[PDB]
Amino acid sequence: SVMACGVTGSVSVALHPLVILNISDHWIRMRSQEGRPVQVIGALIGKQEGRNIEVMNSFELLSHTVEEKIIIDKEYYYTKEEQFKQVFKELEFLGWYTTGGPPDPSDIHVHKQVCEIIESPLFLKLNPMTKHTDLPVSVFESVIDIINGEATMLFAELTYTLATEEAERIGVDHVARMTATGSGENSTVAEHLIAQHSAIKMLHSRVKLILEYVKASEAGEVPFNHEILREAYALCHCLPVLSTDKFKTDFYDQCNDVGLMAYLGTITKTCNTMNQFVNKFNVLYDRQ
Amino acid sequence: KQYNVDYKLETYLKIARLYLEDDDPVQAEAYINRASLLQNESTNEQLQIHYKVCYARVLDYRRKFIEAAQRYNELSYKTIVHESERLEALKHALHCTILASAGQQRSRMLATLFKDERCQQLAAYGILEKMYLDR
Amino acid sequence: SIDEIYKYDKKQQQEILAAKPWTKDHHYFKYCKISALALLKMVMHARSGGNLEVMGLMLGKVDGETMIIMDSFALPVEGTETRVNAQAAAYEYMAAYIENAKQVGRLENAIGWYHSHPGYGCWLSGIDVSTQMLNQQFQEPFVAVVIDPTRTISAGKVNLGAFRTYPKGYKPPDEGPSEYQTIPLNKIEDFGVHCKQYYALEVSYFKSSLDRKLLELLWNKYWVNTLSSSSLLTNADYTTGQVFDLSEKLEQSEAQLGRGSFMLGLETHDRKSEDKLAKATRDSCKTTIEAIHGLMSQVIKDKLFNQIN
Amino acid sequence: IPYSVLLKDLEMRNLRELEDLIIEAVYTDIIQGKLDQRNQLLEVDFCIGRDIRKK
Numbered sequence A: 001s002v003m004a005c006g007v008t009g010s011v012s013v014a015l016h017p018l019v020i021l022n023i024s025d026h027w028i029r030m031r032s033q034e035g036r037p038v039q040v041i042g043a044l045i046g047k048q049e050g051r052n053i054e055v056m057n058s059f060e061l062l063s064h065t066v067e068e069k070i071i072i073d074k075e076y077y078y079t080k081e082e083q084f085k086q087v088f089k090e091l092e093f094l095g096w097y098t099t100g101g102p103p104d105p106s107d108i109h110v111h112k113q114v115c116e117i118i119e120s121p122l123f124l125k126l127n128p129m130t131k132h133t134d135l136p137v138s139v140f141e142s143v144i145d146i147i148n149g150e151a152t153m154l155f156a157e158l159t160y161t162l163a164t165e166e167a168e169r170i171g172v173d174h175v176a177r178m179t180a181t182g183s184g185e186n187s188t189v190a191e192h193l194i195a196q197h198s199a200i201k202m203l204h205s206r207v208k209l210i211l212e213y214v215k216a217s218e219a220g221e222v223p224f225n226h227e228i229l230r231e232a233y234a235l236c237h238c239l240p241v242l243s244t245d246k247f248k249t250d251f252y253d254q255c256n257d258v259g260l261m262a263y264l265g266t267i268t269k270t271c272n273t274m275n276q277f278v279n280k281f282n283v284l285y286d287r288q
Numbered sequence B: 001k002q003y004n005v006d007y008k009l010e011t012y013l014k015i016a017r018l019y020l021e022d023d024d025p026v027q028a029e030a031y032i033n034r035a036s037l038l039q040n041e042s043t044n045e046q047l048q049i050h051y052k053v054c055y056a057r058v059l060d061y062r063r064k065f066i067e068a069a070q071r072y073n074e075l076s077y078k079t080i081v082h083e084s085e086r087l088e089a090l091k092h093a094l095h096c097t098i099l100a101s102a103g104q105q106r107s108r109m110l111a112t113l114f115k116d117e118r119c120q121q122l123a124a125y126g127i128l129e130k131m132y133l134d135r
Numbered sequence C: 001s002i003d004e005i006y007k008y009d010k011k012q013q014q015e016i017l018a019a020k021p022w023t024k025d026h027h028y029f030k031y032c033k034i035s036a037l038a039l040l041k042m043v044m045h046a047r048s049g050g051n052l053e054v055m056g057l058m059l060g061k062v063d064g065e066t067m068i069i070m071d072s073f074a075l076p077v078e079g080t081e082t083r084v085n086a087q088a089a090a091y092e093y094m095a096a097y098i099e100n101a102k103q104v105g106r107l108e109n110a111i112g113w114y115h116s117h118p119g120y121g122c123w124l125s126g127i128d129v130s131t132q133m134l135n136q137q138f139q140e141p142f143v144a145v146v147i148d149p150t151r152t153i154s155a156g157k158v159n160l161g162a163f164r165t166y167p168k169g170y171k172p173p174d175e176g177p178s179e180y181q182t183i184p185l186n187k188i189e190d191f192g193v194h195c196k197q198y199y200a201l202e203v204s205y206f207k208s209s210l211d212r213k214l215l216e217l218l219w220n221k222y223w224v225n226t227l228s229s230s231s232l233l234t235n236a237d238y239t240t241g242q243v244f245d246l247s248e249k250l251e252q253s254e255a256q257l258g259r260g261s262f263m264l265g266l267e268t269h270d271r272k273s274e275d276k277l278a279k280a281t282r283d284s285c286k287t288t289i290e291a292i293h294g295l296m297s298q299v300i301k302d303k304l305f306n307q308i309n
Numbered sequence D: 001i002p003y004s005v006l007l008k009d010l011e012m013r014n015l016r017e018l019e020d021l022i023i024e025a026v027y028t029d030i031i032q033g034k035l036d037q038r039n040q041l042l043e044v045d046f047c048i049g050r051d052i053r054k055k
């Protein structure tokens, strides 16, 4: 077993969408080049402030399989290290990433070589063949444990977060707006209401968890979890919200405005269809 | 007789300080100027620090409480300034911030002054604490 | 097949580069398809900049009348927007970057250059035009991409343009819709001038697995409050501009039709008028679907939250 | 909350002390909201919860 049991995260890891973007692109191209989903290996860079680690960017590494062992071209990694120096100074190496499922007895070999380079590398593994609705990205750290009298390096899962800036947020929001359309338009409202469906599902799952906790407290658990059940009941008392004449008036105002806009759009489509029909009819029987 | 830039700075600084203690600084405005006019020529950091303290004092006196608080706050995070003087300069920054015109700039300074732990040591620590926390 | 576009066919690219069909037509390249990755990287770099122009190189390929951008990378250069062919200062760097990229399986070569116009729209200035002209003198198939990171944020819609220059002396044909941009006083003067000067490439893009990963992750959390109001279209600048352009287009169509009623036997005029009317109708329609989807999301969510029980 | 309800449920006679009590509660981080004096209304955006008798 390469996974440590009972070991909690010692540092906080912040991940950016660009890192996941690099991993996905690396896996796709290698799959396209060599058929099956060939495992990819790259490196992680970013800023580290004490125990707070922020992974802002990531890049690829050259590796070779010799004696059924993955040998990372650290010389290429070092050649690429000064290459990224020429563009960015504030970004420092933080760890390496790969693709696959559970850790295999080859990633430990990769990690020990990366641990040789720097003081403390971070290990990230992405699962491109996942089927659940959760993020198939996990961050692991290096821990030394005495197993059967021998010091064996293990991986401890880290409770990383997803940190992003206003820029990236707006950018990917409009990337989703652009995916809402396309050359091969299958459906648009389908994707829209599927997105709302996923959001409502997340909220419903939260409500189910709260209700289950309340029922358990009624049965066992803590009879009163203090501020938690207090705030839960208060929020359930704010569920009605209560609108005023002005809010309903403004809601109906916006609805009427955009409905009039929709009516105008339907009129435009209908008049275009009428123009096409008239153009065809003027050729069907009419002259001049 | 080319008085070394420090000497002209020292003389003009002394006139401004003398006028500040007498409070007729219509001329000390013109004297903190001619101190400033040749200020960006001098070398002595301590003289520069002594200038910025006097310049911040001039801002505090006229109407520039918001600007003096900015200058005092900039001088607060120094090292060659005595710790007692650093606390005094920050205390001057806190008093000027409270007395300045209540606006966006003053609100930001109140937020900035709610970071120093030596602000907490001051007696007016409560005053801005109620202030910035909207009381 | 969503991932078909990611397949690189080197011999096919060599065949296209030997054929040079763009020499037969200065309007040959009409479409610009951009991957998610490239666009995201570019936007991020430009916004880190903030109010200063940055630039970089785009890696990709060609496919018929379509230019395809697969990836991009920043260039460590000074004088973007002031120096003609500023990219030239990074020549050595570009050679090494690409060499190292080839070592890790990046097979696509240089397809263009991108740079930012923070808060002044997306167009080609006299300098940009000189640079892209030189970039189309030695590397004819080159696309210039311009991004406004500031307007992207303020408008809530990606502000990007793809452009190609005309050779010295060559005049554009009758068509040129030219969407108006709110560039500053003198910047807009020069903008009208260079919109008359170059030609834009229809932004096409492609939904892929890169896009699938992004849309899914950001919507889950950055949109825990899937609210974000619901109408970033409330700003009467984009929809209103489209409405005004629609009105101008249909007014010109009517003006053409009125004069065309006197000439008996002009089929081309009828064809052009019908096509213009159809294009205007589709533009208005797509605006209508956008508004309707916005209102639908708004209605469902606000009804649920305000009056669930 | 209209000012009429505030003067009734709390034995509030002088409206001046009513404002003093309202601002005192807000500044002690009890209730977050806005006061409308032209319409004599108290618009509360957020407030703390209360206890439960297990019923």
Ligand SMILES: [Zn+2]
Residues within 6 Å of the ligand: C081, C115, C116, C117, C123, C124, C125, C128, C146
């Ligand atoms: Zn430019």
